[PDB]
Amino acid sequence: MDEWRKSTDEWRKSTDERLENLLNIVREILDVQRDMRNDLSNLTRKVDRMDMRLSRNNNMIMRSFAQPITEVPFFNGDIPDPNLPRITRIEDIDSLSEENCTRYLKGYGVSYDENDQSLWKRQLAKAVGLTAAYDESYTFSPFSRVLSETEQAEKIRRLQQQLDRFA
Amino acid sequence: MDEWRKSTDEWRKSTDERLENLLNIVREILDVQRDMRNDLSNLTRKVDRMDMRLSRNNNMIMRSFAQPITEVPFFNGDIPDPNLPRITRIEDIDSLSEENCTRYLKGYGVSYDENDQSLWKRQLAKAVGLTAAYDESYTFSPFSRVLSETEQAEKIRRLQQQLDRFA
Amino acid sequence: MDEWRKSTDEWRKSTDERLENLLNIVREILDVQRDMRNDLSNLTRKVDRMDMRLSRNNNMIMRSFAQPITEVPFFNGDIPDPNLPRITRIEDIDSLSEENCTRYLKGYGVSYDENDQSLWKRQLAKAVGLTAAYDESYTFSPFSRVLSETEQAEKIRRLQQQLDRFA
Amino acid sequence: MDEWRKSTDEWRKSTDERLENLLNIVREILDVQRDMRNDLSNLTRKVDRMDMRLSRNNNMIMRSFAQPITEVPFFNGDIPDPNLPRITRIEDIDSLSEENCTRYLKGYGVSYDENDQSLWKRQLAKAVGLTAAYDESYTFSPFSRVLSETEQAEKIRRLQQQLDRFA
Amino acid sequence: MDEWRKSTDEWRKSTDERLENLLNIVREILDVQRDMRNDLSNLTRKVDRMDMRLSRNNNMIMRSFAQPITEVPFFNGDIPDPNLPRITRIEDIDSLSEENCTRYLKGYGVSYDENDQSLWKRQLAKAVGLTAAYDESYTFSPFSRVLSETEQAEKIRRLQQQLDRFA
Amino acid sequence: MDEWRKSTDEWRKSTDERLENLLNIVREILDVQRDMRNDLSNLTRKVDRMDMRLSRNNNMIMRSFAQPITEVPFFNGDIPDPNLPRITRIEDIDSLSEENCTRYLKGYGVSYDENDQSLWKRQLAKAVGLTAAYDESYTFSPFSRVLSETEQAEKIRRLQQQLDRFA
C-alpha cells in the first residue's frame, strides 16, 4: 500500500543510518582499547624494573648494618630459578659454577663481556647489593579461564581487521 | 512488486548478517574489558605493597644517620588511622596500649602469634624501620559521578550475561 | 500478502528491540572505558613520584658509603633538562646560577620561598639525597601512529556525546 | 807538736762537718727516689688501662665497617692466656665454657654478678667491642741481671732504714 | 812517733782523696735526677692529652651507632667541675649559660674568639665528639706523707745549690 | 798523749766505718738509677706507638663520616718529614713517587716486600687509616743546658765503673 510503501522507505532511511552510527562507534571503541593496552603493558615493565631496584636497596642497607642479605628478582618480576644456589654472602658468589654466573648476569640487567671473564664476580656482587667495606675488599678467586597479555593484544588486532573487512 | 519483493529478500540476507557481525564484535570487546580490568587491579595491589616497603627503607636510612623517622602506610595504601598515636621513636612503641599494637600489626603485613604476646613490640619495630644499633639494644617492658573498582567489575559481569541471554 | 504482512510486522518487533539492546550495551561499555582510563592515569602519576623517591634513596645510601651520587628524575618521570649542569657533589650545588636553582626546585616537588632566597641550596641538597655528615656541615656561599593520554580521554568524551545525541 | 796539735784540731772541725753534709745530701736524694718511683709506677698502670680501651675502640670501628675483630689485652698489659679460645665473632662468645667466661670477665675490668649468670655473655660482648646492629640483636643461648718494680721499691725502703739506723 | 807521724800523713793522702771522690759522685747523681724528673714530667702531660683525645674518639663512635655519649676530661686529666651541667646531647649544649661555655672551652684545648660569640656552641660540640649527621644539622639558638711534682723539682734545685756552696 | 792516742784510735774505728757506709749507700743508689732509667725509656716507646695508633683510629672514624683525614706520626713520635707530600685522599697515595712510598712504609711500622712492589699503595692506605667503602674499591695504577736519653744512660754506666775502680 502506498502509505505503507513510504513507511518502509522512510524506515530505510532510518535503519541504515543507525547501523552506520554503530559501526562508527565500534571502530573508535576498538582504537581506544588498543591504545590503553599498550599504555598498561608499559607500566608493568617499568614497575618490575623498579621492584628489582627496590630489593637491591634493601640489601645495601642491611649490609651497612652488617647483616645478611636476601633474594632479588629479575627484570621481569620472576623469582630466580629454583635450581640456582642462593646468595647471602660474598663467599657464596665466590663458589659459583661459571655457568650459574651467566644466568644471574642475564637475569639482572647487567651487560658483561663474553670473552674476558676476569670480572664477572664483581659485576654480580654489585647487582645483588653486596657493597660494604668488607665486601669491596674481598678478593675473588678465578673460575676453575584466563587470557594472557600478548594473547588479547593479538585478539584486538584480528578483531579490528575482522570488522574492517566487512564494511 | 516482484523485483521489489526480491529487493527486500536480498536486504534480509544483508541485514541479518550485519547484526550477527556486531553481536560477535561486542562479545569479544567485552572479554577484553574483563581481562584488562583484572590485569590493572593487580598492579594497584603490587604498587601499594611496594609503597609500604619504600617508606620503610627511608626510615632505615634515617636511623643510620641518627635522625627521627616518619609515617609508613598500610598494605593497601591508606594512611594509618588518625586515632592511633604516631610513631617516631622506640620509646613510642614502648608505651602502646596493647590494643593499638594489633591494629598496627594487622595494618602492615606481619603475621604474629595470638596467644604469646611476648614479642609484639619487636615485630612492630622491625615493620616500621627502627633497626639501628641503639634500637636493637632497647629492652621493651611488658604489656600492662564516579564508580569504584568492584562496582564496574560487577557491571561487566552483569553486562556480559545481559547480552548473552538475548541471543 | 497477509501472512507476508505479518511476517514483516513481527520482524519489526524483533529488529527494533535488537537495536535497542545494542545501544544499551554500547552505553555501558563506554562508561567502563572512561572509568578505567582515569584509574590507570592515576597509577602513572603515583609510580612516577615513587620513582623519584627511589632514586633519592639510592643516593642517600651511596653517601653513607662515601661514594658519589647520580641523577634523579622529576615528578613526572622525565630526565632533567640537558642544559642543566649535572649534580654529583655539594660543591656542584654551590656554584649554580640562581636561575638553575629554580628549575631544579620546581622539577622536584619542593615548595620554596620566592623572596627569601637564603636557604635554597639546602632545600636542593636534601631533595637530591646529599645528606651525610660531611654534607650537613658544608657552608654554602650566597648567590652572586600513536595517541597520547589526554587525546584519547577527550576522544571518549566526544564519543559518548556523539552517541547520545543520536538517540 | 803544738801547731801540729791545732792543725789536727781544726781538721776535726772540717771533716766532721763534711761528713754531716754528705749524710744530709744522701737523705734527701733517697727521698726524691722514693717519690719518683711511685709517680712512675702510677703512669704504667694508667697507660695499661688506656691500651685496653684503645684496642676496644679499634674493634668497634671495624664492626661498623662489617669486618672481623682482633685481640684485646687485660688491665695490666698482658696478653690473654694462650689456653683461652680466641674471640672474633658473637658466635665465638656464644660457645664459651662458662669457666672461660669468668677469666675474661676478670681480665677486663667488668664487675659482674656471681649468682645471676643470666647476662655474662653480653657483658663480655660489650667489653671486647662487639657493638654493631647485628651483634646487639643476637640472642645468646644459656650456659649448659734485671730487677722488677716492687723489688727495687722495697730496696729503697730498706736502704733508707739502713742509713737512718747508723746516724 | 815518727812512723806514727807518717802513718797519719799517708792517711791524709787517702782520706782527702776519698771525700773528693764522693763529692764528685754526688754531683753527677744529682744531675741525673734533675734530668730524669723533667723527662718524666713531660710524659705525664703527653699522656693526659692523649686521654682526652681517646675519650673523644669513643664518643664519635657511639654517635655513629646513634647512642648517647659520656664525659670527657680536660687537658690535664682532671674531671670536669662538679658544678657544670653534664653533656650527653646537642640539646644539652644548646641551653648552656654562656658562662659555662667558657669553662668548657678553656678546659679542652680549643682557642676561641673573645668578642664574636657567634660560634662557641659548635666549637664545643666538636670538642666533645658530637659529630654525626643529626648533630651537624642542628641549629643552635643565640645566647640570651707525700710530695708533689714541683715540690721535689724545687727540692732538687735547692739541694744542688746547697751542696755546691760547701765546696 | 796516751789518752789523746786512744782518742784518735777510736776515731779511726768510727770514721772508717762511716765511709764504708756511704760507699755502700751510693752503690745501691746507683743501681736504682740504672733500673729506673730503663723502665722509663720503655714507656716512652710504648706511648709513642700508642700515639700512632690513636691518630689512625681518628682517621678511620672521619672516613666513616665521609670527611677528609689528617696527619699520622711515625713509630717514635716525630712528624713526617716536611719534604714529603701530605696525604688526605686515596688520590694522594696514588701519585707518589715510588721513593716517597718507602719512607712512609718505613716510618710506620709496616713490613713490606722489597722486590714485589705490586701492593705497596694498599699497605700504606691501611696504615694511614683510609679504610672506607669508597677507598677499598679504588684501583691504584702501577708505579711509573740539657742532656738526652742515651747520654745520661751512658753517664750512669761510666759513673758506676768510676766508683767501683776506687774501692
From Swiss-Prot, chains A, B, C, D, E, F:
The keyword Nucleus applies. Its main location: nucleus. It comes from the Eukaryota. One of its GO terms (biological process) is meiotic cell cycle. Keywords: Meiosis, Nucleus. Has a role in meiosis. Belongs to the UPF0612 family. This is Meiotically up-regulated gene 135 protein. It comes from Schizosaccharomyces pombe (strain 972 / ATCC 24843) (Fission yeast). The lineage of its organism: Eukaryota, Fungi, Dikarya, Ascomycota, Taphrinomycotina. The chain holds residues 211 to 354 of 357 of the full protein.
